[PDB]
Amino acid sequence: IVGGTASVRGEWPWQVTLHTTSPTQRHLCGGSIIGNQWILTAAHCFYGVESPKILRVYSGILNQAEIAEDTSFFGVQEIIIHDQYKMAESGYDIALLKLETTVNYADSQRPISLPSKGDRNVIYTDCWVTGWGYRKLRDKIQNTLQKAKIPLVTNEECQKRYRGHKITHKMICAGYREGGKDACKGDSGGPLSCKHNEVWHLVGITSWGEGCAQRERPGVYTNVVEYVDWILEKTQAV
Numbered sequence: 003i004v005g006g007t008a009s010v011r012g013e014w015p016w017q018v019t020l021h022t023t024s025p026t027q028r029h030l031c032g033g034s035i036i037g038n039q040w041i042l043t044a045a046h047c048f049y050g051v052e053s054p055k056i057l058r059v060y061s062g063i064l065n066q067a068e069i070a071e072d073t074s075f076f077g078v079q080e081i082i083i084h085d086q087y088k089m090a091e092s093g094y095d096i097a098l099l100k101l102e103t104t105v106n107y108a109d110s111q112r113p114i115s116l117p118s119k120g121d122r123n124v125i126y127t128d129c130w131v132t133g134w135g136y137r138k139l140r141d142k143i144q145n146t147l148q149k150a151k152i153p154l155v156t157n158e159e160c161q162k163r164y165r166g167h168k169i170t171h172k173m174i175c176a177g178y179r180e181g182g183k184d185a186c187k188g189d190s191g192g193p194l195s196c197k198h199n200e201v202w203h204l205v206g207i208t209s210w211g212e213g214c215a216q217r218e219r220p221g222v223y224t225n226v227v228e229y230v231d232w233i234l235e236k237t238q239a240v
């Protein structure tokens with residue numbers, strides 16, 4: 003996260019840190035708890051991941067220092083990537099992780115509500131992006147979960163800012179005209195969370211951008227409301 007601040011413990015209790023054990027253990031991506039056995043994240047996080055067996059999900063984490071070899075984690079039973087996903091910049095950057103055990107909800111870890119299809123008209127004015135990513139384009143993974151308030155931009159505006167890309171209605175953008183605050187490397191798969199009427203929704207998934215925090219380069223997020231049928235369909239049994 004560029005231009006953000008340290009979070010309070012438990013203010014983002016849907017936020018997970020997804021780790022890989024290969025070759026040694028490190029943070030890979032963000033993700034959101036959406037159900038007792040379900041993390042929602044970005045499809046591009048699994049480039050070159052051959053097996054779900056090298057994945058570990060940590061919940062209720064503020065600082066990465068909390069993760070040691072004795073720290074408990076959720077194993078991943080199944081990675082489900084959207085079958086139309088080819089790569090982040092051309093959309094469909096959405097994946098589900100089916101955990102091996104279920105999350106026991108608490109003030110430290112519980113789920114975020116998916117957007118309603120009826121919410122497509124709501125103008126959100128209280129949106130935050132969170133993560134352990136870089137504080138600038140060349141940098142490293144941060145210890146403490148950062149947060150940044152960032153206004154959504156319209157798809158017409160965002161399209162103007164990426165004339166070499168096709169910014170579709172299944173993408174949503176957010177950023178300042180002058181830059182300054184943004185997601186950056188390490189943040190992807192994490193939530194773009196918008197509070198409306200005292201209720202938080204999972205409006206987007208951190209996907210990509212050109213650079214981090216540049217002027218006239220909004221962050222691009224998976225537009226979650228566009229995938230509520232896909233999520234329902236994929237999270238059923240057998």
Ligand SMILES: O=C(N[C@@H](Cc1ccccc1)C(=O)NCc1cc(=O)[nH]c2ccc(Cl)cc12)c1ccc2[nH]c(=O)cc(O)c2c1
Nearest residue numbers: 028029030047185186187188189190209210211213221222
């Ligand atoms: O590059 C990373 N993530 C990329 C995506 C990715 C994920 C997994 C493997 C390869 C690449 C990212 O966050 N991508 C999102 C992203 C990148 C960027 O440069 N600018 C942005 C501007 C706006 C928005 Cl919304 C997103 C971005 C990434 C992930 C985990 C890491 N762990 C480490 O221990 C050390 C790292 O250096 C590291 C880097």
Ligand SMILES: [Cl-]
Nearest residue numbers: 164165166167
């Ligand atoms: Cl472009």
